[PDB]
Structures are given as C-alpha cells and as structure tokens.
From a paper:
Also within this category are RPTPγ and RPTPβ, which have the secondary pocket with a basic residue albeit with bulky residues in the gateway region. The basic pocket is also found in the phosphatases RPTPγ and RPTPβ; however, the topology of the region differs in these phosphatases in that the gateway region is inaccessible. PTPs with particularly high enzymatic activity against generic substrates were RPTPσ and PTP subgroups R5, R3, NT1, NT2, NT3, NT4, and NT5. CD45 and members of subgroups R3 and R5 were extremely promiscuous and dephosphorylated most phosphopeptides with reasonable activity. All members of the R3 subgroup as well as RPTPγ were highly active, and it will be interesting to establish how this activity is regulated in vivo. Particularly notable within the RPTP group is the significantly different electrostatic potentials of CD45 and either LAR or RPTPγ.
Author numbering: 826 to 897, 903 to 1000, 1015 to 1122
The structure:
Amino acid sequence: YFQSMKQFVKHIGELYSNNQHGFSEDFEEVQRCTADMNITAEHSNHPENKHKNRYINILAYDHSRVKLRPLPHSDYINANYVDGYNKAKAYIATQGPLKSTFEDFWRMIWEQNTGIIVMITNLVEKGRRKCDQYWPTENSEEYGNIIVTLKSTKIHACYTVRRFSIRNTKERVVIQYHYTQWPDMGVPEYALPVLTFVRRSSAARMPETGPVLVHCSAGVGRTGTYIVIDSMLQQIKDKSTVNVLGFLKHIRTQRNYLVQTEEQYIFIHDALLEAILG
Ligand SMILES: [Cl-]
Ligand SMILES: [Cl-]
Ligand SMILES: [Cl-]
Ligand SMILES: [Cl-]
C-alpha cells in the first residue's frame, strides 16, 4: 500500500539521522551475521581450483555454488545462485572471469540457459586489472565448445549494451549490460544512472530463461548492490512492503560478502528513494 511505502521512506530518513547511526547499526549487524555463521566452501579451497578464483579470499559457498557438468574438479566455477524478490535462483553472482576460466564461464552460461549478463566493472580501473575481456571485440571468438559472436553494440553515457549470439559446437541470443561509470573510489554520486541501468537490464529478462548472470570484479560488492536494488524495486512494484535488511542477510548466506560496504548499503537506499520519488 501507499502506507507501507510512506513508512519505508520515513525509515530511510531514520537510518540517515544522527550521522547515519542507523545505517551503521544495520550494516554492523549484517557483518556480524556473516562472521558468526559457518558456511562451507570446500570446493573453492581445493588445490586444483585455486587458480580459478580471482581473489584468494572470495569464495563460492558449497550449498549455492553453480556446478558445471563434469568433463571427460572440472565442475568448479566461482559463482553462486542468488535469490531474487520471490524467485529462487534468480541470479548467478560471479567474479569477473579470468583468461583461465573463460571456457568455464561461457559453458556455465550455456548450461544454465542464461540470456542476460550484467557487468558492473570496467576491465581496468585506475590502472588495476579488475576483469579479463571474456568477449570478442569484433566478430567471433571460440571458448571451448562455445562460439560467441558480437552482433551489435550501443554505448550510452553510463552503460554499454552488447548483443551476442552464442552457439554450442558439440544458437541463443545473450545480451550484456555493462555499466561503465562506476567510480574508481566510492559509489556513484548520482543514483539515477544506476537506477536506469537496473530498470533496463532487469526488463530484459525474458520468460523461461535461466538466471541473470551478475558480476563485477570479485562478484560481491557492486554485484550485491545491483541484486538488492533490483529485487527491492520488484518487491515495491508487486507487493509494496520492502525489507532491505532481511533480504540482504538472506542473500549473504548465498554468496560471501554480497553488498560489501556500508557505503553500498546506503547507496541502495538512496537509489530506492530516488525511484520512489521519481
Ligand atoms: Cl551443492
Ligand atoms: Cl571460476
Ligand atoms: Cl584481480
Ligand atoms: Cl533481473
């Protein structure tokens, strides 16, 4: 209803009050929940899989990890299923792929029936490598049994959309929504561009398709921020009634560190407030 929307908007101001005391309290709770819960990630730590992780301390929880079909530890990718508002396994949250995991990455896309990739990092930021370029600059590239062809590109102010066709050589359209303006440090000054990106990339999800693949560099901070904004917008649209903190605690059981920073937690609320007022 209008009334629960009114209470949420008021709750946002509450969190902001007293030098953001409520936001800090909320996020400290989130971090403590993560610290206290024991969630295994044995596969991520297996010696054979160590080179498949971009970061030694960003793992894939066992219970929610995406499994690749075994090949004649070939089942491992640093990726997890993550819920959306009502829908189980609405997303696959994953790291920016490495050259050594490009074949695995595209095979996962294929096997999962994924039609949309959401990328929320530049390849290099402030001279530091954040992600390897897992797609062809032009024409086609073969990544094991998957051939990926770049059909077309549209470069907007804050995001780029690349339309691919992929084919398993042992054809499907896959669209990449690539946000290109996230700052080197902190969060975006203005939420509106991110809101537009979330709305357009989320609207691209078609019926009877697999999870939307979301990644940044580690696949935790910006990735989690996207998933929470998208999911809470969908909840507001359908139900009203938002529960950002409970949703975040829940997804944090599915992939380590989703929404990594308090600044991101606050940004989520800025973005939802802008959506509500717009
Ligand atoms: Cl499992
Ligand atoms: Cl991986
Ligand atoms: Cl890296
Ligand atoms: Cl979505």
